[PDB]
C-alpha cells in the first residue's frame, strides 16, 4: 500500500500545472480522496477533496483556480492547478484521510520567475595554520543554486555528518555540510556528493 504523487516542478506566476497521484493497494473510487500542501512554515493546509460520490470541495484560497478529479478506471487522482501564484509554492501531498490516514512522499511545486541554477561546490578543508589532530572536521560549501532541493552525501557512509539549513542570499541558496573523522584516516580520501535534480547536475569533490 503506497501513494505516489507526480508532476511538480518549476512554473512561472500565472502558469498552470497538473499533478497526478497513483496508488497500490488503495481503490480511490471508494473514498474521499484529498490533496493537502505543506508551506515552508511547516503547517499543513487543505487544498481539495472529492468524495466517492464525485462531489468536489475546495477552500476559498483555491476555489476557482484548482480542480480535483478522479479517473475511476485507471485509478488516478488529479489536481489541475491554474493561475498559479507564488503563494501556492509548496510540497503537495495526495492522501486517503478516512480511517487510517495514508499520504505519499509529496511532490514540490515552485511558482517563481527566477531561473534554475546549478550549485557551485567548494571544498572546506583546514590547510596550514591551525589544529590538526584526532578527529578533523571537513566540509563542503554549496553556493549559488536556486531551486532549493539539493542533497549532500559523504562517501555514502557516515553519521558524523552535519548538514545545515540552506539560507537564501541574493536570490540564490547557499548551505554547508560538515563531517568529522579521526585524523588516523584522512589518507583514505573524503568525498562529498552534491545532487541538485532541478538541474540534473551532481558534483563530487575529493577533499585534499
Amino acid at each position: 500500500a503506497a501513494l505516489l504523487e507526480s508532476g511538480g516542478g518549476l512554473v512561472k506566476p500565472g502558469g498552470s500545472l497538473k499533478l497526478s497521484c497513483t496508488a497500490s493497494g488503495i481503490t480511490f473510487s471508494r473514498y474521499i480522496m484529498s490533496w493537502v500542501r505543506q508551506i515552508p512554515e511547516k503547517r499543513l493546509e487543505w487544498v481539495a477533496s472529492i468524495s466517492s460520490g464525485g462531489i468536489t470541495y475546495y477552500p476559498d484560497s483555491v476555489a476557482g483556480r484548482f480542480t480535483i478529479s478522479r479517473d475511476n478506471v485507471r485509478n488516478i487522482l488529479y489536481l489541475q492547478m491554474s493561475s498559479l501564484r507564488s503563494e501556492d509554492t509548496a510540497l503537495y501531498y495526495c492522501a486517503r484521510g478516512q480511517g487510517r490516514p495514508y499520504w505519499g512522499q509529496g511532490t514540490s511545486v515552485t511558482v517563481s520567475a527566477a531561473k534554475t541554477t546549478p550549485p557551485s561546490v567548494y571544498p572546506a578543508a583546514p590547510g596550514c595554520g591551525d589544529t590538526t589532530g584526532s578527529s578533523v572536521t571537513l566540509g563542503c560549501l554549496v553556493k549559488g543554486y536556486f531551486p532549493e532541493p539539493v542533497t549532500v552525501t559523504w562517501n555514502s557512509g557516515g553519521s558524523s555528518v552535519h548538514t545545515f539549513p540552506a539560507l537564501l542570499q541574493s536570490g540564490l541558496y547557499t548551505m554547508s555540510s560538515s563531517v568529522t573523522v579521526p585524523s588516523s584516516t584522512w589518507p583514505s580520501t573524503v568525498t562529498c556528493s552534491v545532487a541538485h535534480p532541478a538541474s540534473s547536475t551532481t558534483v563530487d569533490k575529493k577533499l585534499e
Binding site: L44, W46, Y57, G99, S159, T163, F164
Partner: protein, 214 residues
C-alpha cells in the same frame, strides 16, 4: 474544528516519560464509538510519519513506547522512555469531518548535559577566490544548550554586516546542536586584511572559544 497544542514541551530527560497535550473545539467521538484523532511526527527533512490513528491504534513500525489517551475533546500523547531519535514535532489532527484541520505541532525538547562546541574555521578555497569571491566558514558543532553567540573580527575589528548564520535542530543521536557561521566578502576585501577571527561565546561555558587564521 480547531485543534490546539502548545508549541514546545518542557525539556525531557532521556529514559523518562513525555506528555504532549492536544484538544479540539468539538468532540471527535463518532456515533460508532470511534474517536477520529490521529497523531504523526515530523522529523527534520522528512515526510510526516503516522504514529497513531483512531486514537488508540499504532501505525506500522511504531514501538509501544507510544500511546494515546483521553476523552472526546482532550488528548495526551504519551511517550514512555524517551529516546534521542524521538526528537521532532508532534501533531494531533482530526479526520472526523471533511474540512481537515491540524494542530500546530509540539516540539519535543531533549534535556542533556551541557556541552562545549567544537569550533573549526576554514579559509576561502582557491577555487572560490578564482571565480572572484571569498567566504570564510566556521563550524560550532555538538554543543548544548543551543544558546550561543558568535562574533567575527576582521583584523581584530568589529565586523557583522556580511555574516550569515544557520542552526541545526537537536541532533537525533547526541541530542546536541550545531551551527554554521559564514562571512562572505569580495575577493578584494579578503586579500586586504589577513587576521580573521571566529569567536563563539557559549553562554554557559565561559572563556570564549575562538579560532582564527592569517
Amino acid at each position: 474544528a480547531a485543534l490546539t497544542q502548545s508549541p514546545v514541551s518542557n525539556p525531557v530527560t532521556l529514559g523518562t516519560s513525555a506528555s504532549i497535550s492536544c484538544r479540539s473545539t468539538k468532540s471527535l467521538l463518532h456515533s460508532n464509538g470511534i474517536t477520529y484523532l490521529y497523531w504523526y511526527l515530523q522529523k527534520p527533512g522528512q515526510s510526516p510519519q503516522l504514529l497513531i490513528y483512531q486514537m488508540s491504534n499504532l501505525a506500522s513500525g511504531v514501538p509501544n513506547r507510544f500511546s494515546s489517551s483521553g476523552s472526546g475533546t482532550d488528548f495526551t500523547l504519551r511517550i514512555n522512555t524517551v529516546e534521542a531519535e524521538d526528537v521532532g514535532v508532534y501533531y494531533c489532527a482530526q479526520n472526523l469531518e471533511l474540512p481537515p484541520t491540524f494542530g500546530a505541532g509540539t516540539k519535543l525538547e531533549l534535556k542533556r548535559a551541557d556541552a562545549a562546541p567544537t569550533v573549526s574555521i576554514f579559509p576561502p578555497s582557491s577555487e572560490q577566490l578564482t571565480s572572484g569571491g571569498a567566504s570564510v566558514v566556521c563550524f560550532l558543532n555538538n554543543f548544548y544548550p543551543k544558546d550561543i553567540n558568535v562574533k567575527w573580527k576582521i583584523d581584530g575589528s568589529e565586523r557583522q554586516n556580511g555574516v550569515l548564520n544557520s542552526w541545526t535542530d537537536q541532533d537525533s543521536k547526541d541530542s546536541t546542536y550545531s551551527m554554521s557561521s559564514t562571512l562572505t566578502l569580495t575577493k578584494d576585501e579578503y586579500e586586504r586584511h589577513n587576521g580573521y577571527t571566529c569567536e563563539a561565546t557559549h553562554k554557559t561555558s565561559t572563556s570564549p572559544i575562538v579560532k582564527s587564521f592569517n
